[PDB]
């Protein structure tokens, strides 16, 4: 019965696609007959929410999603999550899950590899209260809870960042690596620096909360200027 329902869903989707294509073609033909050029406007095709068939992005309305960002495929954003400007989350291969109160910086690219070995999730899972700097590149990583990632940081597939860890900016966590909790790691080959202090932990939490508030302010400002959906 499940296969029959899937077949019915695909048949209805294809019928709707056919009807929409026929309607757009008829409108273009009438545009031609009227001596009209409205049909020829090279408006941008970018869609900040691009579902890959059944892989529909899902997010709470509390989230802030930049108009120029691109959420493709199976993306699941938690409450109050802020997505930076130009950030791409490609869930075409596997799901990209982001926790509550998580900040993703501008120009941050998150994607997944095709396959990985056993016991290694191929999905990019990001915990709650994570702060990700601008210009980061995440691939099939597991960032858990209150983790700070510096700007221009590359996290490779199979990497696991444990709760309460800080990665210095302009760093690279290689594939299959583990960042222990409560530690600072720096350098393109990430090396241990020091154990985090209470002051540093509080400062990072305050900074990510400030980023969340800034994202809320950005959404409020963009809604007023008619630059935001809904």
């Amino acid at each position: 019965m499940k296969l029959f329902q899937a077949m019915w869903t695909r048949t209805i989707y294809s019928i709707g696609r056919m009807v929409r294509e026929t309607g757009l073609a008829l409108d273009r033909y009438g545009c031609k007959l009227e001596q009209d050029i409205s049909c020829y406007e090279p408006l941008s095709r970018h869609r900040n929410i691009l579902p890959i068939y059944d892989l529909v992005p899902t997010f709470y309305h509390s989230t802030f999603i930049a108009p120029n960002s691109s959420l493709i495929g199976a993306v699941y954003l938690g409450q109050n999550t802020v997505v930076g400007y130009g950030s791409t989350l490609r869930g075409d291969n596997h799901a990209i899950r982001v926790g509550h109160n998580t900040v993703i910086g501008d120009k941050v690219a998150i994607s997944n590899v095709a396959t990985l070995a056993a016991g290694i999730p191929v999905s990019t899972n990001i915990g709650n209260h994570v702060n990700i700097g601008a210009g980061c590149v995440l691939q099939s990583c597991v960032v858990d809870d209150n983790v700070t990632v510096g700007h221009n940081t590359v996290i490779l597939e199979g990497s696991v960042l444990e709760r309460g860890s800080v990665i210095a900016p302009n760093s690279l966590v290689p594939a299959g690596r583990l960042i222990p909790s409560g530690q600072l790691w720096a350098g393109s080959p990430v090396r241990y620096v020091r154990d985090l202090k209470e002051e540093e932990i509080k400062l990072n939490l305050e900074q990510t909360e400030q980023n969340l508030s800034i994202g809320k302010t950005h959404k409020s400002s963009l809604i007023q200027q008619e630059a935001y959906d809904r």
């Binding site: 899902t58 997010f59 699941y76 590899v113 990985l116 070995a117 199979g158 290689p174």
Partner: protein
């Protein structure tokens, strides 16, 4: 030849199957048998695979 053990019965074999280098991606190891006579992925009968995450988020937004 003495240390060779690709199936991990005598020398333990990681599920990750290899330690990736700090300059290489985490590609899988090539299997000893490269047969491509594989079915589609087999899931147990009566497998509940509904998109529970999306359903919960839609319920919250509704």
């Amino acid at each position: 030849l003495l240390k060779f053990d690709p199936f991990g019965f005598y020398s333990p074999k990681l599920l990750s199957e290899n330690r990736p280098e700090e300059a290489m991606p985490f590609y899988e190891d090539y299997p000893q048998n490269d047969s491509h006579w594989n079915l589609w992925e087999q899931f147990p009968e009566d497998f509940e695979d509904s998109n529970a995450e999306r359903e919960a988020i839609l319920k919250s937004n509704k």
